[PDB]
Subunit: 456 residues, 4 copies
């Protein structure tokens, strides 16, 4: 209905190139049919992740010239701190070099073994850090989130009856915290409504339960709220973002997503004692409370980017660029998760590869075939990424078996999207040629980053 | 492909203001309805010129960090010198801060007063430096080049009969040189064939006449040759460039055009004694022969960009992006100069606004309307820019009353082109509503730069 | 020459300023009398640490423009990898965001709880990661390293008899590894001889014991070998470095020291299995095996800086600039650790404050006093940094109770060193006025980074 | 005997080669014993000029990432405009790519055939543009300026009697303007007093005569005023600069000197009519009035740097670093121009090599020897640069036969100065071994840059 032009100009460029199909085939076999193991120079359009692949602005790069590299008390730390305090409203901030650094801190601090962490689906590293510290993870997202072809708004919402049932069955004091993610990545980058955030806050508060947001794509989320939730039409993105976090006790953020940077994240909290504990731990893994495993210039760039993300036209274009790709795939009949989310289009590999069972890793193989036929790199987001259940030793078997076409922010154009859509539409015409995979090498956790496979 | 995807990704972005229509209207009126008085900060898409507005590459910006700022013997100078010798095949090079710096040097070195300089049309600064040093300019472009709507290939070609005629009516000894421009800006960015460059070289050499290229858009020109001149389909852009200059005795270059930089130019020649004399003169106006009024980093950026310009996919996309805008305008019935040239689309503001007389400044108001409706700045290239006749006091009346949509290299997308086209097309549907202008402040010189207007 | 000029020019600058004494006193109080808690903007000359505070080169800032920010397979990773393979000679490399990220990995991978890690003294984070994974740390440095005034060469050498005794008493199978640090920071930056490294490799290999170097100041170390170990005087820094690591099974390194960067580190090993295991773990804490919690641009800068550090004139100047500062203090009677080490001058606070006992934290108070009187920040390196013995709950009581005047690489001049020395000399004249401190806030590990104190 | 520490620390370094003496001799030979022909890569300490060789700040480099490269109405133009209007107090500013571009403009604008332009000595390019436009030059500096060893304050002052004399003999209507330079370069960097600027303005104003400054080293000049002129002890650098230009009708500025940039200049004036004419001409030679042959980023850097220059500690250190080298040379008995100027030390090569006559080029040979012995490049500033008087074909015979040790701003340390001094002193102690030179290649004009020599 609307695909706006880029609300910015190109200031500098990076060359892209395609290698022949025959070379891509060798590369893909070299990589054990795992797109995560391919090499950057062999990729033409790199949709592996929107993590840390974003284009910075001229103002960010100006800040990159103004790094105060002091070991302690860098002025760039104070700019970051004031910016996050202003925009998110949390009392305290601890920088980390990226998101999983903050998850490591939060999980060590806030989980006793045997407690439960509940959330609206999960991100791989987030769940791993919860479980590594002794938590049992419980999925409390609404059922609709797991239905790929279901086109409803705010699919990321928590089901308050699931949360209430967990409380009734396990007791509030045995829930370490709720991890509320905005947006919800596995559902396709699906937003959570303000009404749901408020409802979750009221119920958890009544039971003394803490709520930490996974804030990684919170600006994308705020845009969906402005666009679709009644009563927010006229509120600014910044106001919506500030209200969202008013319903939380803290957050983990990978700045490498919505803060428009190549590195960076942080942990926020309102509680003073937790803040003191977090500082005692940040020095073990990351660095000082005033740099957290980041150079000063990166704290600067992250401060500037988070503020830039609040510009309405930027985030509207960001999200509608993704929608353009998904709209084009859907109009051609390629099966995708719906509605399109904020950061990626998720192909529905279960439908794309109906000739394979999920045990033959259709998402992983489709990702491989897309690179072979198009030079586009995408991510597996199904049974491989979901990992092994620690308790049963068997695959987690998510209902969503998808391939993620993940869009870095401010990097590509609509013409690049057309390339991506065309090549996937042409692969769809011979989708029965996609072969099942088996493991030849499986890491003990987060296996999808470096596992190797062979064709069945 | 008609319209290829960009053969690069965005490395960094330039922040723009997405100023709405009501505010653009206020800004346009405060500019005296003169786009030259607009502030850059208030412009979304700036098509005033392709000069010095290009986006550099990551490699060029790496070069910007390696500026050897020494007054003499800079490594960056030696890199520029080697690059230009390699790619253009001239013996000697003298850097200048931009094209008209080299034009100053060439016209002082190579023109004895009274001599003739003949070229395929002309450019403002180039002709001015010729005439300033006593030359008489003669236009030897083919008659077709002055027919704005005639769509023929290699429209910038010289008419060899005109050059022969000049030689017989004036004598070769009285011709300082032939100024062969590639492309021809005033015809709309029209290319010159290799066959024509060969023919021109042959005739002149037979009479001892020198040929200096105005080379500012030589790479665009090279693309047209690869695309459309029989025999060159399989030659690389570099091979075409090197052959082109092999038919010249030297050149003046604005790096600000096809060397993909924001400042920079140079003078090349093969003659040892002209070179000695250029090195004396460059000290007067520009700088040392080893930096030419450029920072070392800029010599570096220009060395790198000129070589990046040789990449086929880059220049193909550069030219086809301009063609896309022009094609889209032409399909909607918008009157343009044809065929579309390499760097810009020229709107025929006379036909656009037939209901206005030339004295009511149709090009100038159309330009103003374009900004109001889209945030796009465009250049009046008609009666206002032609200046006033001071002997008679009436306007100089240009044959071409145009608005120039000049496209910087690697800055904009096809979606920006759609903003431009869509907005001009809507203005075309209501062309009768475009109001004439009248002066309210007219300076005596450079009136295009600071004049102010009110609607009649 | 005893004090060579800088083997480089200044490319860009950062202003320095001093706030008045009365304001510094307030700042010192607000900081709990812990220099680690002061803010950068309040520091005149910041000698807190040489960690990450280095000035990068033009070549490094060129690489900073060439960040390939791909999530997997960045070109910058492969540059780092081949640079470290070339210069250190290890088979495999895993990037980490800095040194303690590498330490986390090594200690988790190579320690069975109950085993011993033996080393020539220790760095705080290194030992903490050893202990938190269940090792007992054993100091096997030669006795002389603990004798502040004893001016002998290669104070950092392991005592082979101490190592053999540990083997005899505890069994080789109960030794997780030997952590051999080059230089040895706590002894004052004291080098290890190539003969010692050889002897250690011969003994350990016969017992099946692995040796991992803490390579963080290995280039400083190499310089001392070149300067003072007979038969190396005309070998290149690079040769020496490569031979040093030929005696190791791997290493941890903080690039923020001798790789001349503001962020960055890595883990190296020769063993194939351990490498596979390291990659399974890097994704939990840091990131992919091909970015390790760094931006692409940072792997690039680190690759470039490590190679720059091999330049003899650079490392000669670096080390002799520290010596200059130590020579000036010593000549004026200020007590220092001797001989001066590679990266810092260590004030002997035991002799500076003979009126205080070590239980009164003379080093912590001397660092506070230096800042208040001069605006120079320096680090406690005594009883506070030594930490708390977790078994008995008592302070570790190091013989060395020192203050570290830590020199960032390529940042300051000899004139700055003169200012530092003059201010400390003047303080020493009223040394009796320095008051003892006591804890008011003690973190549970690594307490020196954020502890707060008050005067006794 | 105050030599302050640098009021900045090193943010980034420039890589340098330090080739040994035997290779420097080889290079010096290949260069024809002319230091202007040496390559930058072969020089350790490059004191050829303070022009465009300065180190910029982090703030300037952040400005470099904020280049608004628009052809008209760039934010960087507006920032430069308001900054110069503010700090110099002129009504109108026209940017130019460097000083001699502005001189071209001023001389074309303000000189009528046959008029006189009188100044306190002259600079090469400034006087050339004056004469080229029909002016007759007249030196009205005080006679003292020409006496090298005369150590008096404000040596650049104009002699009011000579000005009154010129007026009486020639008539004020035949004087185009007084060209007053601050500092006076050819006298050795000698300052002009506020008293003299005031008196010059008074006398000229009495006769309706214009005064235009050469402002290139106006900040250095302001420092001398602050340090030494009674009435200005308590005035800031900025207040002094602003008062200085209040005694002028306009100025030409090379930003490559006291604006702390690598490229840039401008033309200032108060007269509305001359401004309009200057805007007409700037288009011919430089660019639009809105960029003047500069990239937007450079207008930015120059705007930032002019303001930085006003910082007392910066300019105090700048001047006292030059003074340090001069004082060390004079204490060793090396003959120099006195007092030491703002930007350079001038060796008196006449006395240094009193065994040679001027016609044997003692300054040129000394410069050669300085480089061979230290890797310092310096500028011949004597008979060779004076040039031939080609009316007669003989050498011009300046009273000042000098070698200029020209100090770029913020690039070097006092340790570098010691390198320079130590080597020159060693040379001085066997100054008889310096061999005379003779032309083997002389150009007709500007022989300083390309002439080549051999030992007699
Ligand atoms: C063919 C050709 C050129 O195209 C060219 C640059 N073209 C301009 C600049 C420009 C010049 C005057 C007024 C305006 Br309005 C705008 C443009 O905007 O099209 C030059 C000069 O080169 P230079 O600008 O580097 O000195 C020489 N020959
Ligand atoms: C007083 C004063 C100057 O000193 C000056 C430049 N001064 C140089 C450069 C320089 C070096 C060698 C030959 C030449 Br010829 C020139 C120097 O080394 O001292 C200029 C021109 O400014 P510009 O260089 O920006 O055009 C105007 N006035
Ligand atoms: C990417 C991500 C993370 C982890 O962030 P990193 O910076 O990659 O460690 C956590 N949660 C979500 C929802 C993410 O997308
Ligand atoms: C600085 C240091 C470390 C830790 O590295 P970080 O990058 O600070 O985490 C480890 N060992 C030694 C000897 C060090 O000096
Ligand atoms: Cl992922
Ligand atoms: Cl000149
Ligand atoms: Cl420390
Ligand atoms: K520009
Ligand atoms: K740092
Ligand atoms: K990245
Ligand atoms: K320069």
């Amino acid at each position: 209905m609307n695909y706006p032009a880029e609300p910015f100009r190109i200031k500098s460029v990076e060359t892209v190139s395609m290698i022949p199909r025959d070379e891509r085939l060798k590369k893909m076999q070299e990589a054990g049919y795992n797109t995560f193991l391919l090499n950057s120079k062999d990729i033409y359009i790199d949709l592996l992740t929107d993590s840390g692949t974003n284009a910075m602005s001229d103002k960010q790069w100006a800040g990159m010239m103004m790094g105060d590299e002091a070991y302690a008390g860098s002025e760039n730390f104070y700019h970051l701190e004031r910016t996050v305090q202003e925009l998110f409203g949390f009392k305290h901030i601890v920088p980390t070099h990226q998101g999983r650094g903050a998850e490591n801190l939060l999980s060590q601090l806030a989980i006793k073994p045997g407690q439960y962490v509940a959330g609206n689906m999960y991100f791989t590293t987030t769940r791993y850090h919860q479980e590594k510290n002794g938590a049992v993870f419980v999925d409390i997202v609404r059922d609709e989130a797991h239905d790929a072809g279901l086109n409803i708004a705010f699919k990321g919402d928590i089901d308050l009856k699931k949360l209430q049932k967990l409380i009734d069955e396990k007791g509030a004091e045995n829930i370490a915290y709720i991890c509320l993610a905005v947006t919800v990545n596995l559902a396709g980058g699906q937003p959570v409504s303000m009404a749901n955030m408020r409802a979750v806050r009221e119920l958890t508060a009544a039971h003394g339960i803490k709520v930490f947001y996974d804030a990684t794509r919170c600006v994308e989320n705020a845009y969906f709220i402005k666009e679709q939730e009644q009563g927010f039409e006229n509120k600014s993105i910044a106001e919506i973002v500030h209200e969202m976090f008013s319903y939380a006790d803290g957050c983990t953020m990978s700045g490498k997503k919505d803060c428009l940077v190549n590195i960076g994240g942080f942990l926020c909290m309102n509680d003073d004692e937790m803040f003191s504990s977090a500082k005692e731990l940040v020095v073990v893994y990351e660095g000082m409370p005033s740099y957290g495993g980041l150079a000063g210039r990166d704290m600067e760039a992250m401060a500037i980017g988070l503020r830039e993300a609040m510009q309405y036209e930027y985030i509207e274009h960001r999200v509608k660029q993704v929608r353009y790709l998904g709209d084009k795939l859907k109009a051609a009949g390629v099966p995708i998760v719906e509605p399109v989310g904020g950061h990626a289009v998720f192909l529905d590999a279960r439908r794309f590869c109906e000739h394979l069972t999920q045990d033959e890793f259709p998402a992983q193989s489709l990702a491989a075939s897309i690179y072979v036929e198009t030079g586009v790199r995408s991510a597996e987001r199904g049974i491989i990424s979901a990992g092994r259940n620690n308790v049963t030793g068997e695959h987690h078997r998510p209902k969503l078996e998808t391939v993620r076409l993940t869009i870095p922010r401010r990097v590509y154009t609509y013409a690049h999207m057309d390339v991506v859509a065309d090549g996937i539409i042409k692969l769809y015409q011979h989708k029965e040629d996609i072969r099942g995979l088996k493991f030849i090498y499986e890491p003990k956790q987060l296996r999808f980053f470096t596992a190797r496979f062979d064709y069945i």
